[PDB]
């Protein structure tokens, strides 16, 4: 297991997300679904010229899996996946510059719900999760697990878990007071409200 420090700007963003009073926490799901859609777009585009890129799975979709026993909500996609280098490099985002721009915008009056416009929507997961685990598999690289409970560091290790084929799984270990996001009707409501027109099937698992 390798442990890394977040860049200062990202630690700052995470602390702000965790410590700022903001009731509209449901936006985290929209941001993660949006990220999954973008990753699915990427593998779709690559497959247009190299159909064999889909050898690792032809179906392009998103699964939402609540687990009340583990107090987790997991968002799974079969998108392009990330390399180890991507994970370390702020999970394939331009988080350093994006954070700067998000900050500049917040000063220009913007609110936290606009976070996705700056390429750092992922970190909104920390509105509802005490810990986030990201499992990912990119074609021709191994499966890796990233994990962080904030506090300035993250870990990366090779994943010995269930082989994914290709794509990304975001596991949200929810805060004790955020278990509404495991309720079927609540997830349905959020998806219908914020993600009604995503171009890939979204399947909400039941328990």
Measured distance CA(81)–CA(139) in Å, rounded: 8
- Does residue 133 interact with ligand FJ3 by CB under 6 A? no
Quote the least distance from Cβ 110 to ligand FJ3, whole Å.
20
Total residues contacting ligand FJ3 (rule CB under 6 A)?
17
According to the binding rule CB under 6 A, does residue 35 interact with ligand FJ3? yes
**Touching ligand FJ3, residues 137-196 (CB under 6 A):** 168, 170
Q: Binding segment for ligand FJ3 among 63-71, 84-92, 153-161, 187-195 (CB under 6 A)?
A: 84-92
Measured from the CB atom, is 49 or 69 closer to ligand FJ3?
A: 49
Minimum distance from CB of 52 to ligand FJ3 (Å)?
18
- Full 3-state SS string of the chain: CEEEECCHHHHHHHHHHHHCCCCCCCHHHHHHHHHHHHHHHHHHHHHCCCHHHHCCCCCCCEEEEEECCCCEEEEEECCCCCCHHHHHCHHHCCHHHHHHHHHHHHHCCCCHHHHHHHCCHHHHHHHCEEEEEEEEECCCCCCEEEEECCCCEEEEEECCCCCCCCEEEEEEEECHHHHHHHCHHHHHHHHHHHCCCCCCCEEECCC
Interacting stretch for ligand FJ3, rule CB under 6 A, among 8-16, 47-55, 73-81, 189-197?
73-81
77 labelled binding-site residue: yes
The residue with its CB nearest to ligand FJ3 is 39
Which residue in 14, 27, 32, 190 binds ligand FJ3 (CB under 6 A)?
A: 32
Distance CA 9, CA 12 (A): 5
Is 122 annotated in a binding site? The answer is: yes
Residues making up the binding site for ATP: 35, 77, 96, 122
Q: Enumerate binding residues for ligand FJ3 (CB under 6 A).
A: 32, 35-36, 39, 77, 79-82, 86, 91-93, 122, 134, 168, 170
């Amino acid at each position: 297991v390798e442990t890394f420090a977040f860049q200062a700007e990202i630690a700052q963003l995470m602390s702000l997300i965790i410590n700022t009073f903001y009731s509209n926490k449901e936006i985290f799901l929209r941001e993660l679904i949006s990220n999954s859609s973008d990753a699915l777009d990427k593998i779709r585009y690559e497959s247009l010229t190299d159909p064999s890129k889909l050898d690792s799975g032809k179906e392009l979709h998103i699964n939402l899996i609540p687990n009340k026993q583990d107090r987790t909500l997991t968002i799974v996609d079969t998108g392009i996946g990330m390399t180890k280098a991507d994970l370390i490099n702020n999970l394939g985002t331009i988080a350093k510059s994006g954070t700067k721009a998000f900050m500049e915008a917040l000063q220009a009056g913007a609110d936290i719900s606009m976070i996705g416009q700056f390429g750092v929507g992922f970190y909104s997961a920390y509105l509802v999760a005490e810990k986030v685990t990201v499992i990912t598999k990119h074609n021709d690289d191994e499966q890796y697990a990233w994990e962080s409970s904030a506090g300035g560091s993250f870990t990366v290790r090779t994943d010995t878990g269930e082989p994914m084929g290709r794509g990304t799984k975001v596991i949200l270990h929810l805060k004790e007071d955020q278990t509404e996001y495991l309720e079927e009707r609540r997830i349905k409501e959020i998806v219908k409200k914020h993600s009604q027109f995503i171009g890939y099937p979204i399947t909400l698992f039941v328990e």
